[PDB]
Amino acid sequence: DFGIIVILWKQVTVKEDGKVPLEPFLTAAKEVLRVVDAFGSGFRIVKNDIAGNIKKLYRANQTVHAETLQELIIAENSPDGLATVALLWLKRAFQFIASFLRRLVVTDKSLEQCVTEAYNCTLRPCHSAVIQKVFWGGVKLAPSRERFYRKLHPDLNIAKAKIEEFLIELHDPLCCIVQFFFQRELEDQCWGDEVYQRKDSSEWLK
C-alpha cells in the first residue's frame, strides 16, 4: 500500500498563509520511513534521524499544542529548542530523500550514484568526518534501482509512478519549511537540490 504516502502528503495542505499543519505533517512524515526501509540497513543513520525526530516533535508539542510547525518553532524561539532542532534535521533528511528519489526517477544513473549526489547536496556538510564515513559505509549496501522499487511495490511501474506522485505532494510543504528555516536564520549548511526546490511542484519532472 505504498500509494498511501501520496494520500497522506496531499493532506499536508499549505494554504495561502504558508503554514504547515502539524498533525498531518507528522502523520505523513512517518510514512517516509517506507522509503528508507526499502533501501535497507545502509540507511540506518537516515532512518534513525527521521524516526527519532518525528518522536521529538510529538514530545515538543505535548504541552504547546501548536496547530502548525511554524507556530511551534516560533513558540520555542531558540535555535536550541527541541522542536527546532528536530525539525531542522527532519527537514534536512527529507531534502536528502527528495533529491535521491528525483535523481532516481528522472535519470538513468545508478541508485548508488543518485544517493551519492543527493547526500552531497544535503546532509554531507552537516555530518562530521566520522559520520560521513559511516554513511558511505551504508551506501556500499545500496540495492539496485529495481530491487528498491520492488520493495516499495512489486510492480516497477507503480513504484516509479507513486514515487513521482509522492515527490509532487512532498514538494510544497517541504519547500515552505526550507524557506521558513532561512527566514528564521536556522539553516547554515544544507542547501538541498536546487532543481527540486524550484517553485512549481512539477518543474523537476522535465
- Cα angle for residues 204, 195, 115 (degrees, 5° grid): 95
Q: At what angle do helices 82-106 and 111-120 cross, to 10 degrees?
A: 140
199, HSE (Cβ side, Cα atoms, 13 Å): 0
Specify the residue for cell string 546532509: 123
CA distance 46 to 192: 15
**Would you say the C-alpha torsion 192, 198, 204, 206 has a positive or negative sign?**
negative
Number of domains in the chain: 1
CA distance 193 to 196: 6
Which residues lie closer than 8 Å to 102 by C-beta, 6 or more apart? 167, 193, 195, 196, 204
Deposited resolution, Å? 1.4
- Ordered alpha helix ranges (H), the chain: 4-10, 22-31, 33-39, 44-61, 69-76, 82-106, 111-120, 129-139, 145-152, 156-183
Domain CATH number, residue 93: 1.10.3520.10
Coil, strand or helix: which one is 21? strand
List the determination method: X-ray
Main-chain dihedrals φ then ψ at residue 68, nearest 5 degrees: -130, 160
Specify the residue for cell string 517516509: 32
Which residues lie closer than 8 Å to 197 by C-beta, 6 or more apart? 95, 175, 178
The long-range contacts involving 69-74, CB below 8 angstroms and separated by at least 24 positions, are: 69/19, 69/20, 69/22, 69/25, 69/177, 69/180, 70/18, 70/19, 70/20, 70/180, 71/19, 71/22, 72/22, 73/180, 73/184
6-42 burial: b if 16+ Cβ within 10 Å, else e: bebbeebebeeeebbbbebbbebbebbbebbebbbeb
Nearest to 162 by CA among 171, 174, 173, 149: 149
CA distance 105 to 114: 10
Nearest to 5 by CA among 198, 177, 167: 167
State the residue range of the domain holding 10. 1-206
- DSSP states along 49-100: HHHHHHHHHHHHHTTT--SBHHHHHHHH-STT-HHHHHHHHHHHHHHHHHHH
